[PDB]
């Protein structure tokens, strides 16, 4: 029916008018009298050497010391950051891995990729070896991202244009999040783990209610595929990173974009995005083989974490906020501080 | 000034390091191939000659080959094709009998997309033109002019064989960085593995010249 298509357009117009109405002053205008952060001089403290292929993903533990990393070699390595020691090395059934996660408790790790399977690994056994606990199957497409809520719950994004919540014990999808019209690329839990946001190749980000299983809000602005997403520490905003070589800041309550982080010299897309503990810095990996640091309130470049030889694939900040880990296609993680 | 337990934890790290290096050496002594094709255009039959992803193993003349078929992966290629940046070669399959089945043009559209992909600048392509027997029976029935109206030559197998070959090789733009090895395979063959071996040998030589600095 044509009416339905028209009625949709009328509602889209209404939403646009509503979000235009509450737009009164820009973040730039408010953040004019604050002083700049200065020049952010970070140096490489550690270089974690071991992977023999392009590193695709990494994730910190909650302890803010251990971190897991994933590579196309077909290995998860768990590092001790302080000592540059390898704690576990896990051989993977599929070498094609595009994501990995570390449980908050620190008892489990997850990974997945072109196998279309999220594999859970029990780290703490009596036998003293890391074994596969569960292989979660159901997704039709490549597993793009995964993040634990609990020891028994994990949420995954996949190229099949869906996100799914799992009950690890039973190994079944509890609820499926449907809405996107492109390969869902990145995922970010809210602090309270009651909501999460997902960025897809449809150049759109969506807010999900974990419990009810529905799209609460949809965010548009990016011109190209959103490759990275991360939640602001407050939990009332989030930052995306796309192929149009811009990062953007969205707030949930006003339901619109606030700030854009663009520089004319920068033309390559963003791989990865993360915030500082305060949320005053917004770190972003790029395809030009260097990470940049943005004043999240002013939108001025504050520093450059240049060091890697190849694409900065993944980027993570500790919970204590003490350090930054940057994995790359040069098969090295560098820990900055 | 390490403590007793710290030193033992280092010893463990070293053993992990050792076993990682060994697994790497083993991986380096293996040929990795990517298999692409317009639907089922003789990808199955050449696999016999030798779900997200399917992996095949075959050894020939003391050289192990790993062949990855990504047919089941029904998603935007651009978002994962960069994973296979570093494969030794790309085997491409085209059904020569699917010229009148448009599909040939779709195969051509897929071919040039892979050939002129930023990731596969210096990645050789081992094109197989499958189903030549049926094509020889098809050309005498239905002409090639349906597929290629610019084809002015006589509707014979020998001429059309060379013509279609030329079409695909013309799609290649980077003629210096990489090479294309073409072969007319069929269902009743036993020398297709040999043709891959010859082609891969050439790719190894080139990589050997890169390491020495000659190239």
């Amino acid at each position, epitope marked *: 029916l044509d009416q339905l298509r028209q009625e949709a357009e009328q509602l889209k117009n209404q939403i646009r008018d509503a979000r235009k109405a509450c737009a009164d002053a820009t973040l730039s205008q408010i953040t004019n009298n604050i002083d700049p952060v200065g020049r952010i001089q970070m140096r490489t403290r550690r270089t974690l050497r071991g992977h023999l292929a392009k590193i695709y993903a990494m994730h910190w533990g909650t302890d803010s010391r251990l971190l897991v990393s994933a590579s196309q070699d077909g290995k998860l390595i768990i590092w001790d950051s302080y000592t540059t020691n390898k704690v576990h090395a896990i051989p993977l059934r599929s070498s094609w891995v595009m994501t990995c996660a570390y449980a908050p408790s620190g008892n489990y790790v997850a990974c997945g990729g072109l196998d279309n399977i999220c594999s859970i690994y029990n780290l703490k056994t009596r*036998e003293g070896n890391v074994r596969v606990s569960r292989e979660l199957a159901g997704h039709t497409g490549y597993l793009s991202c995964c993040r634990f809520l609990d020891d028994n719950q994990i949420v995954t994004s996949s190229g099949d244009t869906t996100c799914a919540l799992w009950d690890i014990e039973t190994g079944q999808q509890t609820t499926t999040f449907t809405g996107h019209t492109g390969d869902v690329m990145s995922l970010s839990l809210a602090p309270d783990t009651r909501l999460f946001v997902s960025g897809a190749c449809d150049a759109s980000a969506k807010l999900w209610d974990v419990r009810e299983g529905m799209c609460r809000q949809t965010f548009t602005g990016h011109e190209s595929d959103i490759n990275a997403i991360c939640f602001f520490p407050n939990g009332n905003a989030f930052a995306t990173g796309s192929d149009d070589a811009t990062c953007r800041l969205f707030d949930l309550r006003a339901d619109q974009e606030l700030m854009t982080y663009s520089h004319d010299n920068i033309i390559c897309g963003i791989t990865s995005v993360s915030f500082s503990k305060s949320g005053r810095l917004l770190l972003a990996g790029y395809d030009d083989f260097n990470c940049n640091v943005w004043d999240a309130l002013k939108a001025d470049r504050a520093g450059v974490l240049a060091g890697h030889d190849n694409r900065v694939s993944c980027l993570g900040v500790t919970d204590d906020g003490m350090a930054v880990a940057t994995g790359s296609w040069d098969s090295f993680l560098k820990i900055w501080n | 000034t390490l403590s*007793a337990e710290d030193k033992a934890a280092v*010893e463990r790290s070293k053993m992990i390091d050792r076993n990682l290096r060994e697994d790497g050496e083993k991986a380096a002594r293996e040929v990795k191939l990517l298999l692409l094709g317009a639907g089922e255009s003789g990808k199955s039959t050449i696999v016999k000659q030798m779900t997200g992803i399917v992996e095949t193993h075959f050894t020939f003349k003391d050289l192990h080959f790993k062949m990855f078929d990504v047919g089941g992966q029904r998603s935007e290629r651009k978002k994962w094709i960069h994973c296979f940046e570093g494969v030794t070669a790309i085997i491409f399959c085209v059904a020569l009998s699917d010229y009148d089945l448009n599909r040939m043009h779709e195969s051509m559209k897929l071919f040039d997309s892979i050939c002129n992909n930023k990731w596969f600048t210096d990645t050789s392509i081992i094109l197989f033109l499958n189903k030549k027997d049926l094509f020889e029976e098809k050309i005498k029935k239905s002409p090639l002019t349906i597929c290629y109206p610019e084809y002015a030559g006589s509707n014979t197998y020998e001429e059309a064989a060379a013509y279609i070959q030329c079409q695909f090789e013309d799609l290649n733009k980077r003629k210096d960085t990489k090479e294309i090895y073409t072969h007319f395979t069929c269902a009743t063959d036993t020398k297709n593995v040999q043709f891959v071996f010859d082609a891969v040998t050439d790719v190894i030589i080139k990589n050997n010249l890169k390491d020495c600095g000659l190239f």
Partner: single-chain antibody
Amino acid sequence: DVQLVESGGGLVQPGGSRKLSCSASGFAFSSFGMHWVRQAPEKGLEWVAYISSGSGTIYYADTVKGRFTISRDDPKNTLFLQMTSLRSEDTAMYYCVRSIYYYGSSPFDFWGQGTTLTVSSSDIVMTQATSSVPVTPGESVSISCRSSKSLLHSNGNTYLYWFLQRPGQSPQLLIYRMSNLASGVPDRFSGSGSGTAFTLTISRLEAEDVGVYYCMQHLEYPLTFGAGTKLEL
């Protein structure tokens, strides 16, 4: 199901030789440093020898150095102790203990059942002042272990362990690195202390808690145990 069965014990004539064999089943024996720990008929525990994963590091006690030799056969999952020139001192039950060392591991976790050997006729001194203390089921008790040297390291790990040997059983790990409680141990057990002072506080005394409580340092080799405090009543 983790188990370590030792064999090769009996009556040996003095100045002889005997080999012990500790067969392993139900864990990755390859990736576990192994220890030997003796116990004389009516005395506490005494560490003997260690061999790391990879057989790349070996240590011995000063009483056995030269005489005893430790070796492992990873394919067959068996540990060996080739003893030579046996003395009337060596008469002891020999236990076979596993230990894994990485960040946040639990060393000295599982002990074997042991084998009885009978021979016919700079070290850190751990001190438990209390030899025995009577207790009432339901109450709380505290065990005290002192040290000659501060077991706190610069990294910030106080390497002090606690063990329990119930009557007619093998020692069981309770607490590792002063505070961290071991798996399969009730929360009633708790451990705290300083550099040299240590205290194991047991609450809600159970009838199964009766036994001897040892304290062991793992700051530096040789690894030294205390005298042991026996709970009773």
